[PDB]
Design a protein around this ligand. Structure first.
Ligand code: ZN
Ligand code: ZN
Ligand code: ZN
Ligand code: ZN
Lengths: 206, 206, 206, 206
């Protein structure tokens, strides 16, 4: 749990994200909680050229390491960390099904019991704000108060968890739920969902 | 047909399942009939870290090997084995098209002649029950009385056959039929199907 | 252009077909014109275990080599060869989009100028008949009189050309046209098409 | 920035295009600005057999190197270069989602903020004309006056940028926007879009 070990795992997560077909447009950024701030992917540099020394450290004040440019979305990574003290890793991407649901400005309801992996009976959709602004950060902070993942309207997805492996797994599961939702919504609306009682049982079971 | 040979084939089936794009969310579990019970994948451990000694033996009583945790869905694997004496292998996954049809709570009708590979003119959909419960097991046992594969409402798919190779092949074919069904259902409802007479001819031919 | 060279190319075409995502369910079969009949893939044997000596020779009478089982669909390969003297290779598969259009029992109209690669302004759909019957063969023979590719209702696709490389390429293009057609049909029906005049110009240009 | 270095990058872009799933039907062609004209992919030769010496030089007059056949679509590559002096590379393909939107004859509106990567609030659709004609070239030239990418009705996509890496990236992003658009259009029409004000802010921000 030295910086370089953590930097490699961020890079592995970027590669795995592309392998899984979640990083379309090379839009993602990945971060981990570190010291008083976080380690995050840099802006510009394509994922396949990424090396350990490219990873940027941003402190609690928002001051980033000299000579390195953090992702343009670093601020809502910091907002997730402040809003969810238990989160140690954050994954952001523009997975197509998630982003399509975020264009409809819909929450994903409990169409499958795995919806409870994000903490409740839904995956919310935070209202649009211009990328990189404080206003976007506030909407994300509010949406993550009681959920580990959120859609961002007209934009994409943020998922947070205790480590990169779970954060990536969660992100992937939300993309499956989004695809399931869009496929059934094209047939019938509304889509059959599981009741709050049933989801309370599953949550207790998890 | 020693335990280790069977354990390797289970692991190969998990890998092949992911290769085929049926194991989305890393939700599957695979088992084979063995001695008085079965060998099944363990809970927790990601598929790529899976080794022969991770595979768990569960006897006829439901007692599992000391120090190993069987999949959380072991019970409906045991229900399939008791309901279908001819089954020697069972594959479960959350393939997206199958799961989407299971959310509509629909059976897949005879939209293609390959529907007869599961034993009749349809692929049923068993009613939802909380994962891991006896009630889920009963619905699965009933649905598999005269079919080798079934959807599970709000959940996924179970397919069983005489060996892992056929069980995987069947699972894959049901996922193709599910995709075919959802694609045509978005255009027209109902979907044209083949008649019972035609399917009786194909069954006789198989 | 010895038998073994031709047998390798058939096997390569099976692999390439799977690479392209056209061979879903391991449903395809591939043949080439040879001597007085054809060389075709065998029934049963999965594609990845396929070796040169597995390829079966079937003569003009329909008598196949001793000790080898030709694909269960050999008859409509022979029907294509008799109907289209210019065809030297035939590819059959159950590509999902093609098969979904074949379930609607629709012809694919001229939604794109590449429709002319199959010889006219459409890709027809031959009426269903039980697999392996003479009746299926007659429908295929009629549909291929003035087209190099046809859908088969409730079944899949047949594409024929001057060599395996073009036959595979054609099969792939029809699968793209099928996907294009289904995607736009879910939005609007009918789908805008190019006129007969325009297609006559493109045909002249090819 | 010798010819051979540029020829390798064209070939790498063809391979990458196929990797990304944008080159379906082996329909693409790629060019770069060079000397008084351009280097472009040849007609006929499949991408995987492509070697540096296959790449064709076409001058400003349209005269191509002796003994080599340029892509059949070279003319609208030349039209892009004359219309957009800043473009140094041009990518053309028949990506399925783009082509499906081009069959509807629709422009893609601002359903996502990444729409501004092509220069405005939309991705236009140029009216159909027979491939390889001067009339097709004029429509492309007009559509690219204030956009870096355009759909071509009943045909596919053209994307242009300052280098091959950005041109490919742009092409890929337009394919994601096309898929997003088609997925949401099947659910609701019209699709929610971002306002002109919002897009002006994002453009200023880029
Ligand atoms: Zn983003
Ligand atoms: Zn399950
Ligand atoms: Zn077939
Ligand atoms: Zn083209």
């Amino acid at each position: 749990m030295e910086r370089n070990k953590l930097a490699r795992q961020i890079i592995d997560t970027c590669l795995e994200m592309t392998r899984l077909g979640l990083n379309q447009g090379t839009a993602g950024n990945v971060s981990v909680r570190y010291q008083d701030g976080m380690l995050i992917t840099p802006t510009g540099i394509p994922y396949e050229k990424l090396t350990e020394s490219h990873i940027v450290f941003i402190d609690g004040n928002g001051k980033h390491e000299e000579g390195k440019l953090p992702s343009s979305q670093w601020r809502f990574h910091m907002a997730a960390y402040q809003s969810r003290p238990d989160a140690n890793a954050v994954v952001h991407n523009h997975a197509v099904h998630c982003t399509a649901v975020s264009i409809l400005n819909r929450s994903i309801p409990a169409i499958h019991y795995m919806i409870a992996a994000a903490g409740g009976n839904s995956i919310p959709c935070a209202p649009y704000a211009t990328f990189g602004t404080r206003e976007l950060s506030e909407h994300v902070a509010l949406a993550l108060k009681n959920r580990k993942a959120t859609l961002l309207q007209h934009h994409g997805l943020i998922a947070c968890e205790v480590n990169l492996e779970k954060a990536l797994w969660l992100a992937h599961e939300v993309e499956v739920l989004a695809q399931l939702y869009l496929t059934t919504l094209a047939i019938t609306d509304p889509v059959p969902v599981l009741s709050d009682e049933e989801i309370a049982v599953v949550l207790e079971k998890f």
